[PDB]
Enzyme design. Structure first.
Site, PDB file in Angstrom:
ATOM      1  CB  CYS A  88      -0.872   0.084   1.153  1.00 21.63           C
ATOM      2  SG  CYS A  88      -2.266   0.859   0.941  1.00 21.63           S
ATOM      3  CG  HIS A  89      -0.498   4.914   1.125  1.00 23.55           C
ATOM      4  ND1 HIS A  89      -1.571   4.667   1.371  1.00 23.55           N
ATOM      5  CD2 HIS A  89      -0.645   5.780   0.143  1.00 23.55           C
ATOM      6  CE1 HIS A  89      -2.588   5.307   0.684  1.00 23.55           C
ATOM      7  NE2 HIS A  89      -1.857   6.035  -0.373  1.00 23.55           N
TER       8      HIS A  89
ATOM      9  CD  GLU B 232      -3.177   7.967  -2.665  1.00 23.04           C
ATOM     10  OE1 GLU B 232      -2.138   7.397  -2.444  1.00 23.04           O
ATOM     11  OE2 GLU B 232      -4.024   8.365  -1.541  1.00 23.04           O
TER      12      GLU B 232
END
Lengths: 234, 234
Positions: B135-136, B167
């Site tokens: 993910c991030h 996003e």
């Protein structure tokens, strides 16, 4: 908007059960469907203008539902389009935005030596098209040259495709060797490409590296095709 | 045979509903479960030695079944382990085979600046171990250097991660730009990495490139964890 969908032209006894290989049905049908769906015209092509089915891909587990219905119905759009199969000579690369190579273990026989198909593929790529391949389809990258750089089209690119472990699991690894064939992973190494493997040999796994799209197996045909259309914007 | 499972220490109000971001529950749970199942021990660590769960990862659509039961059960292995979470200072890089970076949007706030954690990961990697992020999580690659090359660890490598489009879709790209945060695609571009995206921003999509493992989103936590283990032999 045209899409040139390539099919293997090799169709002969392959599996230890006497079943002959060739075109993996859904690897042609799903891409075809996906293409026709978005509004693309599809022209099938084969090295010799001829083709056969990979008998194993005809088994219930790989051909069923609407797929089988479209397969069995001779008036299906799929069948009507397949009947208009072309030979390389009868093709004008300049007419297609996408070049999609369907697979089946047969591609491991003609795809690497299908120069005319490679010239066409190379041209479409030159005009800003998208080159896609699924399963053993990347086999056609063996010798495919980028006209703009002079280097192998896959050199320095990230691709995926049928796995070496998958060959073992199918128990056809004995045959590939016996028939002096190279695996997708072999081809990726021989030409400087970066082979990216799926978690599992049968997972739906596809990659988009600019305008070069690749998929691993029959379960990735759709994804590959979808990626292939999206890649046009790259 | 142990795993260092980094967690974001950021836990402030994020979402445009007052909710707070932080650690995405399953992104730490599934990896934990996979690693534990294979016999590895797991140690949790964050910049501050503390953390908070991302409010949006707590809904039934992301937290349910055994996961939810293991989350509410104070005597669960997952929870009893989180209680012993350590700080970088308390970490000996040489005691781990894998560095797994769980995410949640909170990681955009601390991972890029968490130099001490980057060193631990550069070290583990230096010892031939595996570096994985979902993910991030790849935000932790911002400034992460390869101890042996001097070059950025992800330079020239193929990775994937939370998409820019995702996003927007979540309507938080505003917050990001406002809080002056950087996306994964940005970090990939900044250090010469080749970002490979999934067809859908929500797809379970991961990549294994040598000993660098990456996953796109919560849906990818498990696969990213599995890819880590398999990677250890690369």
């Amino acid at each position: 908007k045209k899409v040139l969908l390539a099919l293997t032209s090799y169709n002969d006894v392959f599996y230890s059960d006497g079943a002959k290989t060739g075109v993996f049905v859904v690897e042609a049908l799903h891409p075809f469907n996906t293409f026709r769906k978005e509004g693309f015209e599809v022209d099938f092509v084969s090295e010799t203008g001829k083709f056969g089915w990979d008998e194993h891909s005809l088994a219930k587990d790989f051909l069923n539902g609407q797929d089988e219905t479209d397969f069995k119905n001779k008036d299906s759009d799929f069948n009507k389009t397949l009947a208009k199969i072309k030979t390389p000579k009868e093709v004008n690369a300049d007419d297609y935005q996408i070049f999609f190579a369907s697979a089946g273990h047969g591609t491991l026989f003609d795809y690497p030596k299908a120069k005319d198909l490679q010239d066409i593929a190379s041209e479409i790529y030159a005009n800003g098209g998208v080159v896609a391949a699924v399963c053993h389809g990347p086999a056609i990258f063996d010798g495919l040259t980028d006209k703009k750089t002079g280097r192998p089209l896959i050199e320095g690119k990230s691709i995926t495709g049928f796995t070496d472990v998958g060959e073992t699991i199918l128990g056809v690894d004995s045959i590939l060797k016996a028939k002096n064939l190279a695996t997708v992973e072999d081809v990726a190494k021989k030409y400087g490409a970066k082979y990216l493997a799926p978690v599992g040999p049968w997972d739906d796994y596809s990659i988009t590296d600019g305008r070069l799209v690749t998929g691993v197996n029959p379960a990735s045909a759709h994804s590959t095709a979808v990626r292939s259309i999206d890649a046009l914007k790259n």
